[PDB]
């Protein structure tokens, strides 16, 4: 028991962060968009597709 794992033995052997204010702008790769169609609407239309 206590055979704990170690990612790297060096860490924790010799024993507050600056605020990051962004000035430059890097364009966003992707945008989250939420589907607005109501859940009944989507389900009934999908079943309509199946029998069509």
């Amino acid at each position: 028991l206590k055979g704990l794992p170690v990612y790297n033995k060096s860490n924790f052997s010799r024993f507050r962060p600056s605020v990051y204010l962004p000035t430059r702008e890097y364009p966003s790769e992707q945008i989250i968009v939420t589907e607005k169609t109501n859940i009944l609407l989507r389900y009934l239309h999908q079943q309509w597709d199946k029998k069509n």
């Binding site: 607005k36 169609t37 109501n38 859940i39 009944l40 609407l41 009934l44 239309h45 079943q47």
Partner: protein, 322 residues
């Protein structure tokens, strides 16, 4: 039990009415003789904001509505007074029913229903007092009395859906369903006899515009039977229909309405979607007298229950019927 709950709030920092709902209402007043003419004034229920106690006169009849201020322990103070259905002669007792929009709290809508084949239904919207008059805020106070009737297969009241959309009220007459939008101030419901009043006088229709959108049921059913029914090529005749609103989405302005249409007519249940934005798309068809109506309505309520999505508390449509 309450004290340790407040202690939990002090530490957790999370306090919601839902977990303060188990506690009984601390204040409970008899309201005996406190309300004027304790008879002359029948209160329905507490308003959504709670600062008002709606009450109407028992009484042709006048049905004077009177809003009352609500204090923790004091006499209630009448703050508003209107006769609701003014341009409406009355010869029956109506079970008054008033509701408010989920978030458009500026005005409330009251529906009076009574006990043959035709039933009298009266609807009117009144602006709640904003918290010569020479006060523009009071000038907002408006009145929109409206009156119609329905055939023996009386449509389901379904008050919440009928008002799910803000600024708009859906009325399902026996032969059409109307989407009245009493907007006071660019345009909505685009991409019925509604006499208006206010301050006991009738102005021309700060300005308020009622955007009315209707579908004639018979026409849309003819369209659907012509274009979207596999057994519609052999359809002979339809006599009567019941329209039930399954659900109203205000985000996309769609209302899902069901029709239980009836060499003989056979029971069906045909689904319809109406885009209030602008335009009728058939969602789902169906397949093959009061009893079948009741069974159909039972099916609709089963569907609504089976797809119930609890609206966020505060975005509900309070129904107020004593």
């Amino acid at each position: 039990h309450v004290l340790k709950q407040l202690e939990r709030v002090k530490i957790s920092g999370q306090l919601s009415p839902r977990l303060f709902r188990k506690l009984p209402p601390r204040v409970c007043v008899s309201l005996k003789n406190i309300v004027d003419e304790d008879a002359g004034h029948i209160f329905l229920g507490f308003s959504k904001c709670g600062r008002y106690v709606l009450s109407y006169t028992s009484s042709f009849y006048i049905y004077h509505l009177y809003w009352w201020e609500f204090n923790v322990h004091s006499k209630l103070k009448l703050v508003r007074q209107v006769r609701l259905f003014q341009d409406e002669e009355i010869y029956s007792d109506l079970y008054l029913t008033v509701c408010e929009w989920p978030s458009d709290a500026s005005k409330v809508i009251v529906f009076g229903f009574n006990t043959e084949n035709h039933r009298d239904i009266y609807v009117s919207t009144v602006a709640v007092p904003p918290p010569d008059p020479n006060a523009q805020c009071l000038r907002h106070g408006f009145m929109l009395h409206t009156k119609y009737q329905v055939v023996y297969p009386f449509p389901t009241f379904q008050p919440a859906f009928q008002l799910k959309k803000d600024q708009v009220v859906l009325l399902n007459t026996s032969y059409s369903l109307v989407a009245c939008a009493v907007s006071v101030h660019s345009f909505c419901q685009i991409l019925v006899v509604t006499d208006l009043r206010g301050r006991n006088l009738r102005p021309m229709r700060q300005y308020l515009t009622v955007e009315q959108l209707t579908l004639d049921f018979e026409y849309v059913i003819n369209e659907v039977i012509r274009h979207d029914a596999t057994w519609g090529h052999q359809f002979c005749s339809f006599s009567d229909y019941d329209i039930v609103i399954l659900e109203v989405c205000p985000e996309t302005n769609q209302v899902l309405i069901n029709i239980g249409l009836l060499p003989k007519t056979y029971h069906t249940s045909l689904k319809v979607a109406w885009d209030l934005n602008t335009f009728e798309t058939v969602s789902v068809g169906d397949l093959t007298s009061g009893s079948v109506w009741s069974s159909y309505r039972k099916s609709c309520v089963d569907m609504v229950m089976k797809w119930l999505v609890p609206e966020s508390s505060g975005r509900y449509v309070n129904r107020m019927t004593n």
